[PDB]
Amino acid sequence: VHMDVGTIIGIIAAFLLILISILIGGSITAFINVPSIFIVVGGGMAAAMGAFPLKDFIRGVLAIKKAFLWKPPDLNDVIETIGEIASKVRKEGILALEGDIELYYQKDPLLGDMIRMLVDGIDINDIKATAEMALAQLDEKMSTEVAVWEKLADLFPAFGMIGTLIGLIQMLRNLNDPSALGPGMAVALITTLYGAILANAFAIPVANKLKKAKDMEVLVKTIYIEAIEKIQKGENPNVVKQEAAIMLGVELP
Template sequence: MFVIIGYVFMVACILGAYASVGGHIAALWQPAEIVIIFGGALGAMIVSYGGKPLKAIFKAFPTIFKGSKYNKTFYMDLFALMFEILGKVRKEGLMSIEGDVEDPHNSPLFAKYPKIAHDHHVVEFMTDYLRLMVGGNLNAFEIENLMDVEIDAHHHEASVPSGAITNLADGLPAFGIVAAVMGVVHTMGSLHLPPAELGPLVGAALVGTFMGILLGYGFVGPIAKVLENKAAEDHQVLSTIKVTLLASLNGYAPQVAVEFGRKALASADRPSFKELEDFVKATKGK
């Protein structure tokens, strides 16, 4: 939503100001130069990110227009679920959650929190380390190191689309210069024409530089930042699970372990202690 609003506001300001001083909007429409600029930059990106990274880029692109699913409501569900799981472990022992861990899709605990159950990465990360805890062969230090390795690998993978789009945005102004130079070359070969006909050719050449900069910094660059923020959100949710599970593994009670996780959140997504306590009590009784 904010992507569309930002684009509309930007275009309205730029083109509105240009038109207000007598500029002709139609003169900015140069399809051939847009093909040169975008085609060249996309070709370079395909060379750099062909194969699996390119698939990840196309898969991530539709998420640009969607809001974040990792909001306060999601985290309250996550903490309530972890509180119930860790509470069950504390009362009945680690083996009591073996069924929940091995088959979370049929687990009554996970079924109470559909937002969590439908997030493949969150469920897989949580159950993998609960499974290690049930096995009892690794200590807290070893599990923490393993978590860090996995979170770093996941973050690197999630950052590929934003890195690729950033490179695309950086390349667009350069290809805008290419389009402008080609326009100048075309103009130089047309010097026999009268000034009234040369003027549009010169203007069309200059539009290449304008379009490259506008597309790079106005349209594509912000998309890269949106994807970067989404990768950071993925990193935050896994880090929150890590902190909570490690606190439990180090002997803290479920309510304290959940508090460790709550403190790991950014302020915009963090429920208050009272909010979380009331929510956990309400959901636990269901």
């Protein structure tokens, strides 16, 4: 497999046209305003730390590494590992899947404890119904890695409208120098630009690449659950592939 380069070139080339459109006009020393980086970056992170427990914000902020360097699941191997379990259950039975739990526990953590329940002797109606309520609450841990980045997309630009009115009321209070209305409005217009740079170029794409990586990795886990229901029913090994290549949209020769 390889790495999806869609998000690196998507944010590097979004911060490189925001950085060239500055160099095309003035310089890059006017747009650096340090006491207004903390009110949007340091403020939008801390005010969004209180919107979640401490454990769901430490994950959701350290979950960029699943946006930038994400590797899509090889679907031609999701099928092959189903026909590898299927033939194994018909060749050596179902009780001989215990020495291979750790092999499928490296494929994904849900196929590994769904075969452990298969060897322990639990009927499918209690495996397809416990591992379906475990997967729906495994993605609720992935929907909390997004709800952070859907909150930073809402708190970064809404903390610039704070860093502006804080830096705009201070200028109107004095207003005595007539040359303090020009530069005093630009410094108060940067804290908004940082709110629109980070929310649109950085925090919305990561809030979505974290969603298209959930709906894609849940879709593979929602296929293992349907095969295990058809693995223990003794279905033909060549039919659990054929019922998955159709289910995923993959061509098979």
